Amino acid sequence: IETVPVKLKPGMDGPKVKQWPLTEEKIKALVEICTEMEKEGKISKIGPENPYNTPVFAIKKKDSTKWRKLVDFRELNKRTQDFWEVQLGIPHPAGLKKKKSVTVLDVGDAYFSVPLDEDFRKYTAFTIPSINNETPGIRYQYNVLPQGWKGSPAIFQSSMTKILEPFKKQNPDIVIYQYMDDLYVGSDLEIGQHRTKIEELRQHLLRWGLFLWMGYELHPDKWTVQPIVLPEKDSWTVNDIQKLVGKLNWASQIYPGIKVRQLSKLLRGTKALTEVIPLTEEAELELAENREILKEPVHGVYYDPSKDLIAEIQKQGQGQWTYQIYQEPFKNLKTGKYARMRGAHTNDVKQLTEAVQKITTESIVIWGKTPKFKLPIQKETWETWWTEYWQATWIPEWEFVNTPPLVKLWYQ
């Protein structure tokens, strides 16, 4: 009810980010949503003396039919002061990723109950564009904590912890973690028990209040990892052995003691690629020794919260995608694979967008932040389409990979 003073970081001005082009349906949706928000006092029209801008668009959350406004505050978020005054920061909870079930709630609507510092409001400016620029874009700024701004959960935190204490005190084994507009609630209860607890939780927010109804269910205890595995064959061709030596050479950068000497020796001469080569005892032993090495964890892997997380993704075909999350090369913190790309059988870009959201969710649950993606797509293709398939209320950072990696072969 009293505002927290907020400032940008020293020697930085506000965001001045171009609004990207919007379809007619998204413009009409945003005009209707913002008319209501203005009436409720959440946003106000602004004049030309505010030169700032942040892009806005509209999405449909997963399994929903109502448009949701999504403001892309990535630039403002980078420019906004860090928040450690009251809390040093919320040590991320390591137990969340160990829960049998985690449900994600959209609690962003709670933030609109808290006013935003009057001197900071100008930096939240956004524009609803018109088709063909025929009419001046409709200009607004926020009067209340905005969804998607990193300052919102931070300022609202005292209110949330006070709203939640009785649920926590009554259920001490539930893990509850807030990230941006999301609330992550983990338990080891039978799902039925679990959903009732979730609905119990909704009621507290509802009671305090006077898209919240939705629930994204995850099961991180079943989440899958990808160790390095070598083929088991009875007949090896020259080509098979070449592929094996290739894969082992790559793996030797991750694992110290990998050897290819004896396997390489099998191919002495200049043989047809399809010729079958019997493994010698020396080669089988070396292979066996390599297999044993690959059953052990990679050495010297640790998470440093001061460093960015990086996520790489490979298209494997037939709807399959592999990914790795690391901070230092060859020191993977997590690897994985998807094939269950939903409602996207003839659309690569929709699949990739879904993969990016899934990986980001995993990252939030495990480390409490989003990774920087290296995306296997041309910039122009990604930027034209990703917004069509986006269902999350946060947005990670990304860069583009223009040269085909050879490593794709090694995660297949």
Next chain:
Amino acid sequence: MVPISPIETVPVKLKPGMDGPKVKQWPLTEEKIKALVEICTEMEKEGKISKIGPENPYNTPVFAIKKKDSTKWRKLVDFRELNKRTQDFWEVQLGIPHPAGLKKKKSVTVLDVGDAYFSVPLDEDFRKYTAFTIPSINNETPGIRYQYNVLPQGWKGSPAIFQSSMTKILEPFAAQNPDIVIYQYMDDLYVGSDLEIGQHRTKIEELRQHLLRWGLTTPDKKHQKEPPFLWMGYELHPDKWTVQPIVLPEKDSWTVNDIQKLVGKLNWASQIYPGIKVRQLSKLLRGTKALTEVIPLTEEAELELAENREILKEPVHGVYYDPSKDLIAEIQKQGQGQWTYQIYQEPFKNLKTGKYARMRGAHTNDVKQLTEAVQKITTESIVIWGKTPKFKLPIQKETWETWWTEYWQATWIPEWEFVNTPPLVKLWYQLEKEPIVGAETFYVDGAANRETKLGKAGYVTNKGRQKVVPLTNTTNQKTELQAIYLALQDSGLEVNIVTDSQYALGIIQAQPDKSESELVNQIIEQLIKKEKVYLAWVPAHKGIGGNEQVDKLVSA
């Protein structure tokens, strides 16, 4: 007196840390001073400026300029320094409407709002920074000091604040009259509709009545401007649009500058004249920017210019947008990385046209370029019409399916259909997924000495076929490609090739059909001729037979 509503003031600041301008007034002739005094006396009477006391420490220089072929002088208050110190504003006009997104109108009326402009007040707290001084006759009295009360011509904030002020006033009228459109440009309002003429006139009278609420009058004698309108390089008519005349000059010789202007005109023309090309003319501007330098046109550029003259020989117009109909975009390949397109709703009635050129880079293919063009047209269409057109593309559905399913990147093109208009985009080669039984296996390698640039490239095969060629002026990367080329040259229609070159794999896995490298182009030409090619990679220096033998032969 009929009360009028004030126009709300926009609060204005200088940039952080900056004070206002303190710039010396130049001396002026006695004649200029008398003229400026008269001009300023009238502006003062009209309320535009006010005399100020000696306390204000700010100043901006003023000049007098003679209105050509006239005995009347005009003032120029030079606000360049104040402009540097004034905050940035939101600028609404950055993106201009494209004519092809406009809707047909029966009537468009122009209303003059030049007088309304001076009912927009300048923020009281900022006025002091606009101070200026008319020097006195013979410098024998204090110069006359004034400041502005209104948006000064030439000040940074005037266009934005005028426009934003008019928009705010007009908003309720537009909202409650959805059967008209209103557009402001400079000192004019344009008001369009499809109403019968009496009703349209009624709406105009109602607009005039609305504006009087703020004491804003428009001229009774209606504007002289009527369709067609010359605007932003276009001609707008009630039911069609075009570009203003495109006139390509005749020349015996061309400079860099002439050619930049020629390409600029062709670029502007390409938004409604189908098939305009600028590649060969643009190739002439490569690397050099001495505007006076004379560049001989190549035969190819002369052909391009001739083809464009023929395209431009007579007028072409676009139609406006009917939201009730689908948009269709059709694309053709023109050659040399050039693509052209038309966007229409009814057959043979284009809304607009355009072109796309290949991006600069080492290697490319037609499918990638077609994709790029689709993404450009899509983004353009979202801006202009708010929706994606249905595409008609010169690529078979089967070709596209093969491409996207096998390509290492994610890729997508929106709803489209094949149109069988040559030249069709096709895949020129496709590498095997598995080694070929019965095909000879070529182990290739190359190396070069980094100092002498001497090198070797070659192969050994499972049949005992071998070749090593000595090369000059080469590099490790070139020799690795040379070796693959030799293997392709010397093999039958099906071939397995084993390389350790990450560089060569990286190129071939990008699936180019054309390259800036003559060698890569030769390799592509060979690949096109094969029935089956399997390309296998192995790591260098690991004892892998075949590879190890050839590596030894090429390293010396």
